[PDB]
From a paper:
Glycoside hydrolase family 71 (GH71) includes α-1,3-glucan degrading enzymes which could be exploited for biotechnological applications; however, the family is presently poorly understood. To increase our understanding of GH71, we have performed a phylogenetic analysis of the family and detailed biochemical analysis of two of the five GH71 enzymes encoded by Aspergillus nidulans (AnGH71B and -C). We present the first structure of a GH71 protein, AnGH71C, including structures with carbohydrate ligands. These structures revealed a conserved acidic dyad (DxxE), found to be crucial for activity, and active site water coordination consistent with a classical inverting GH mechanism.
As no protein structural information is hitherto present for GH71 and to establish a greater fundamental understanding of the family, we pursued the structural determination of AnGH71C by macromolecular crystallography. The structure was solved to 1.33 Å resolution by molecular replacement using a model of the protein generated by AlphaFold232,33 and all residues of the protein could be modelled into the electron density map, except for 9 and 12 N-terminal residues in chains A and B, respectively, and the N-terminal His6 purification tag. Crystals of the apo protein and glucose-soaked crystals were of the C121 space group with similar unit cell dimensions and contained 2 molecules in the asymmetric unit, while the nigerotetraose soak was determined in P1 containing 4 molecules in the asymmetric unit. The βE strand interacts with βA forming a four stranded sheet packing into a 4 × 4 sandwich which, to the best of our knowledge, is the first observation of such a topology. The interface in AnGH71C buries 21% of the sandwiches’ solvent accessible surface, as determined by analysis with PISA40, which includes several hydrophobic and aromatic residues along both faces and is stabilized by 14 hydrogen bonds and a salt bridge. The most distinct difference between the GH99 and GH71 (β/α)8-barrels is that AnGH71C lacks a region of ~50 residues found between β1 and α1 in the GH99 members, which forms a large loop wrapping one side of the substrate binding cleft.
Author numbering: 32 to 431
Amino acid sequence: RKDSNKYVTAHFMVGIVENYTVDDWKHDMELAKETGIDAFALNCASIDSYTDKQLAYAYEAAEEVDFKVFISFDFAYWSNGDTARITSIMQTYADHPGQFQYNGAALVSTFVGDSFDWGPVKRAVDHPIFAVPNLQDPNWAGHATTSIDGAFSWYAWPTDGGNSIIKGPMTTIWDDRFRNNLKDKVYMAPVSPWFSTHFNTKNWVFICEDLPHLRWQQMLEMQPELIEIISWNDYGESHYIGPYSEAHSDDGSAQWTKDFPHDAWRIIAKPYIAAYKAGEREPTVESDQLVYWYRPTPKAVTCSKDPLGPPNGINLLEDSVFVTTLLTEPATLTVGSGSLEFSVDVDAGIVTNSFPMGVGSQAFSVTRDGEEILGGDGGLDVQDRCDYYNFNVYVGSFSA
């Protein structure tokens, strides 16, 4: 294999892991390694008393299991008055053997913090630093005064700049604005599968649908310098692709996430990550597999007791069951959704098809030359009633 200079990272919420041990970190890291992810962005806050402890555990774990990590300073909490502490943290970790390196320099990033100047940090740390903050305006990325080396976009979902929820499908419009402004500097593109949040302070969806697959196809077209997956473990916004960890701290998101595994989305990601790193325009399918996802009820069901209203944007969703097939040769896909039954011929490669949702049991089957290659029952029966509004999805898979 030829050496590559493209890398995939994943956003990790340090704020929810006060009780993590080194072993807990290692478990997440092994699953990320198996997906082909190169590093976790350790998103952390100045206000958490356990930040230094958990950064130390994560860097130790990464060095022990041949993984890499870098810091995402979360400027919802860190502030422009924190140069001294940010500098001291980078002095500790920029040359750590577990620190992710890009072109010989320690990668550092942010959530927000567009106005934070990296100059004083870089000039105080002997080891080179490569600063790729999260920037909100593509125009600023092209004119920033903060000594940046690239920009990371958080525009992972369909949006038009405003505060209305817009329909999909997702496009590359924002990616292409960042790339135009960045010129020779690097772009770290966001990849997210889904979005649903349901708190007193934030209650909306974005219109994602086929996004768990479609976004990876956009990455092969676009070939950004870096990718960050949003997210490994942000349960509260439903975009996690990592496991539901036993050791994280619940914020109320257990209501819509505890029984909703998302691990099978890593089956889609794995071959696309390999193709992205190799510069290939299509993935290589190693074996026959299927990944499916769907919401728990039809979108129009009224709840019996939710103290929060329905999320903003749900009228734009479809009542669909989504199926990504990963096929070595062409085959036939059959889906039963309640009383509904559908069939479609599917090409070799990785293809997503959506099917009308019916209340009841869900069934999946792929047949080739008249014989069933893979199949089984969906792990969740769709219902026609709910106690609370849950616009997260259940995800599952079958593998030959």
